[PDB]
Structures are given as structure tokens and as C-alpha cells.
């Protein structure tokens, strides 16, 4: 019965009379008995929402905000707070300089977001993200925990809400949370917000330049698995955009160590990050190589077996580390001394898919650059399998599988053979698989790289008299004559050589 009265009183002009009622009203909502009475009365909820909104008293706000907070623990409560436009008003309390009001506000908003349909869209219209992000400078970690979780529910599956967070300086703020705080629950909710934004094609660099890479890597060995995993997935999504950032040295040592974790998923993520973090970046290549990188990546392939989800990123990483940097030879070389060859060469066999076979053809290409690798690669049965894949690849291009064009395969294999043919023993085998007729036909490719390695393989081979007549007798002379004139010095250099030895 009191409800209809206070409702009246809250709509009074004498503000003194109003705050008086919000106090009482807020004392009635403590007991579920009187609480229901309130939820059940639209004039009571509106009343309150309108008072908290319009009020200018630092306690009428407290009590009004306090009241609808205690109303949001139940289903019928949330609807009443929603149907009376209470969200725009709660977003308005997010600017209060009074913590209580603030606290009561982010909690009620969190509740509506979690259970009230229409809440998410309402908070965005009311400009909730911008305000929420402004509140990331607060020093109360629990407040930050609920605030950050709000951003995660609003941003999830919403690029717009994502672009607004980003445009409000959000990234650099969450990233600073990861540098300063040790409260696991905060770190978690934040990490989850960074995770959702790292898939966005605008947020990534914002997160990378603010130092997100180094700050997600700070908690890689914290005890919390959920924290670790989230930090890893986020680091993986950011990795293709982090290839040129300095200071990755420590995150590199940690990632290596994690390959030896007990969680395949952790190992999988880590092999992913090392794979991307090693692309075209010499500083990173050497760091991986310095802290046990090769042996660890190699051990990862072995441990993984058929799991392409692991072998692939890991094999790509070995590929990156074995080229274009001062110690590429030291790497190429180290993969043998750590017993990698057996499992590498084995990966070209079934049931390996093309994505992996391609990447593995590249590692092999690179590993053959090292003379001490020729005999080993041969004795593991590389030439025969490299030779039949090329054949399957060549025939397709005459007969874009799995995202892998067969011409790239045609080039790599023939590329690896061009290199392996630097040994006399290897040469015998290559000839022995009647390949000369196939490389010759490879002279007629519209692609230069292909002509180069075909010419290239044929130059090595032709230094053997008989094999030289084999090529000549194959019709090589004609096409080579044209290749003689290419602008691609490589193709012309090798063009001119076969003819000479021929």
C-alpha cells in the first residue's frame, strides 16, 4: 500500500520530499516481500528510474541506483527496469564521481546484459561502450572485472561495438590492465575482451603497438589455465600482424618452453605463434634458434604424429628458421643433429594433406642447402617421394586443390631436387627414376621459377655424359634455345648451361 504513496512522493516538486522517499523506498527493497510489490508496479519503477536519472543529490542517486540494483536479481525485475528505460539512465550513472552509485550501476548493467533480451542493443544506443571504456582507469580491480566483462558481452560478435571500443582508446587500456594487475579474475575477463578484439581487422595492430604481445606473454606461466589459454589464443590471432615488432625476445623463450607443456592445445597454440612470429624476421629466427627452438619444434612434430594441427605450424616454423638469416646453415644443419629428418621426410607420405606436404617440401628444399644433409635426406628415401609428388602435381596442371595450387608443389619438389642433385650419388637416383623426360617438359612452363629449377636440375644432371645425351635425345635443345633469351637471368643462366654441357 505504501508503494502508491511513495510513487506519489517521488513525483513531488519539493526535492527534499523526494530524497526522503527514495531513502524509504530503498529500505523497502531490502526485503523480498516488499521488493516484489515494487517490481510489480510500473509507476514505481519508472518513478525511481526517473528520479535517479534527474536527481542531483549524491544519495538520492545512491538509493535509487541501489534500489533498482536489488531489483535486478530476478527475472521480473529486469523486465521492469528495462521497460521503463532504465538502461539509458544506468549508463548515465556510469559518470558519477561517487563509487557507490558507480558500483550499483555497473552491477545492474552486468545483470541486464547477462539475462535481459534487448539489453545489449540498449546499452550501445545509450553510449555504454564509450563510457565503459572511460572507466578502465579506475583502481578498484573488482570494479574493473565487472566493467571489462561488460565490454566482452557487448563486443562479442559485433564489429561495430568493436570499432567503437577501439576508437575510444580501449586496446591500450586493456593492455595496460594486463601489465599492472595480478587479480586473476580481472586478468581473465580482460584477456577475454582482448581475445574477441584480436579477430577484428583494425584492432590487431592497436593491440600490438600498445605492447599487447609482451603483456599477454607476462601471464603465460601464471597458474591459471583459463588465463594461460586465453592469452595464447589471443596471441595466436595477433601473430600474423606482429611480425615486425621489436621486443619479442622473451615471449619467444617462453613459447619455446611451452612446446613441452602437457596440454596438446597449449603446444598447438604455441607452435602457431612461433610459426607466424618467425616469418621474415631475422631477429626472431635467431632467438628461436638460440633457446632450444629446433630440437623443441622437432620434438613437437614427433610427439604430434598425424595431427596436422600441430605438425603444420611447427613444420612451417622449422622452414622459416632454416632460411634468410645469418645462421640458416646452422639451423638447416641442426635439424639433423637433433634427429628431425626421419619425421620430416615421413610427412610427405600419406595421410599428410597438401597444406602440410607443401610446407614440408619447403623445409626439405631448405634443408638440402646444407651439403651434410644430402646423404641423410637420400637414405631416408626423400628423392623417390619428392619425385612422385611432382608427378602428381604436374599431371593435375594438365588433368587449386585444398587451397594449394599444384604449380607451387611442382616448383618446390623440382626445387628440392635441383638442390639435392648437387651430390653425385643423388644424381644417379634422380636419373634412375626416369625423371629427365619430365624436367624437359618442365621447360615449357609459363612460370619462370619452374623453368629455372627445371633448367637448374637439368644442368646438374647433364654434367654426366650419358645423362647429357639423355636430355639432348629428349628434345631439350629446342625449348632451351628459347629459354636462352629470357629476361630472368636465372632461367637464361641455366638455359645456357645445359646446352653447353649438352
Amino acid at each position: 500500500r505504501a508503494i502508491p504513496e511513495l510513487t506519489k512522493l517521488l513525483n513531488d516538486e519539493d526535492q527534499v520530499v523526494v530524497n526522503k522517499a527514495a531513502v524509504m523506498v530503498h529500505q523497502l527493497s531490502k526485503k523480498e516481500a516488499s521488493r516484489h510489490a515494487i517490481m510489480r508496479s510500473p509507476q514505481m519503477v519508472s518513478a525511481i528510474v526517473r528520479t535517479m536519472q534527474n536527481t542531483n543529490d549524491v544519495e538520492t542517486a545512491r538509493c535509487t541506483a541501489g534500489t533498482l540494483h536489488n531489483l535486478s536479481h530476478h527475472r521480473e525485475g529486469l523486465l521492469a527496469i528495462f521497460k521503463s528505460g532504465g538502461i539509458p539512465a544506468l549508463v548515465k550513472m556510469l559518470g558519477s564521481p561517487v563509487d557507490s552509485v558507480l558500483f550499483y550501476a555497473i552491477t545492474t548493467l552486468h545483470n541486464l546484459l547477462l539475462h535481459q533480451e534487448g539489453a545489449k542493443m540498449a546499452v550501445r544506443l545509450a553510449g555504454g561502450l564509450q563510457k565503459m571504456v572511460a572507466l578502465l582507469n579506475k583502481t578498484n580491480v573488482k570494479f574493473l572485472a565487472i566493467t571489462t566483462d561488460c565490454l566482452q558481452i557487448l563486443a562479442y560478435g559485433n564489429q561495430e561495438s568493436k570499432l567503437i571500443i577501439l576508437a575510444s582508446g580501449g586496446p591500450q587500456a586493456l593492455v595496460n590492465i594486463m601489465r599492472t594487475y595480478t587479480y586473476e579474475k580481472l586478468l581473465w575477463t580482460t584477456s577475454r575482451v582482448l581475445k574477441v578484439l584480436s579477430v577484428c581487422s583494425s584492432n590487431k595492430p592497436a593491440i600490438v603497438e600498445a605492447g599487447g604481445m609482451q603483456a599477454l606473454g607476462l601471464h603465460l606461466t601464471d597458474p591459471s589455465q583459463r588465463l594461460v589459454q586465453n592469452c595464447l589464443w589471443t596471441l595466436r590471432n595477433l601473430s600474423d600482424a606482429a611480425t615486425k615488432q621489436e621486443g619479442m625476445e622473451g615471449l619467444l623463450g617462453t613459447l619455446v618452453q611451452l612446446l613441452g607443456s602437457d596440454d596438446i592445445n597449449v603446444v598447438t597454440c604455441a607452435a602457431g605463434i612461433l610459426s607466424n612470429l618467425t616469418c621474415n624476421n631475422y631477429k626472431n629466427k635467431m632467438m628461436v634458434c638460440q633457446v632450444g627452438g629446433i630440437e623443441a619444434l622437432v620434438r613437437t612434430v614427433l610427439r604430434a604424429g598425424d595431427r596436422e594441427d600441430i605438425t603444420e605450424p611447427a613444420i612451417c616454423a622449422l622452414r622459416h628458421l632454416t632460411s634468410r638469416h645469418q645462421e640458416a646453415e646452422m639451423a638447416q644443419n641442426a635439424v639433423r643433429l637433433h634427429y628431425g629428418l626421419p619425421v620430416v621426410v615421413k610427412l610427405l607420405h600419406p595421410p599428410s594433406h597438401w597444406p602440410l606436404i607443401k610446407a614440408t617440401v619447403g623445409l626439405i628444399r631448405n634443408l638440402a642447402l646444407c651439403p651434410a644433409n644430402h646423404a641423410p635426406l637420400r637414405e631416408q628415401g626423400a628423392i623417390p617421394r619428392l619425385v612422385q609428388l611432382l608427378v602428381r602435381a604436374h599431371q593435375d596442371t594438365q588433368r587449386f586443390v585444398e587451397g594449394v595450387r599444384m604449380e607451387e608443389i611442382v616448383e618446390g619438389c623440382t626445387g628440392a631436387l635441383h638442390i639435392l642433385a648437387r651430390d653425385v650419388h643423388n644424381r644417379i637416383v634422380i636419373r634412375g627414376l626416369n625423371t629427365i623426360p619430365l624436367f624437359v617438359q618442365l621447360l615449357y612452363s609459363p612460370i619462370e621459377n619452374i623453368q629455372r629449377v627445371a633448367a637448374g636440375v637439368l644442368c646438374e644432371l647433364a654434367q654426366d655424359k650419358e645423362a647429357a645425351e639423355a636430355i639432348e635425345a629428349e628434345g631439350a635443345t629446342a625449348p632451351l634455345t628459347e629459354l636462352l633469351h629470357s629476361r630472368n637471368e636465372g632461367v637464361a643462366t641455366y638455359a645456357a648451361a645445359v646446352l653447353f654441357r649438352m
Binding site: 552491477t107 573488482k142 572485472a145 595466436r236 602457431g272 621474415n280 605450424p313 612451417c316
Partner: peptide, 24 residues
Amino acid sequence: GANDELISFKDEGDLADVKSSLVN
């Protein structure tokens, strides 16, 4: 240029007790 190629990853994906002690 751009030798080594990248792999693209886009894995997008208990506060009740936190909230009660934040108000009380």
C-alpha cells in the same frame, strides 16, 4: 618480397560473488 608466408588464425571464442562484495 614477403618470403615466409603467414597462417591466419581468428579464434574469437564467477563474478556473482565479485559483485556482491563490491556493493556490500
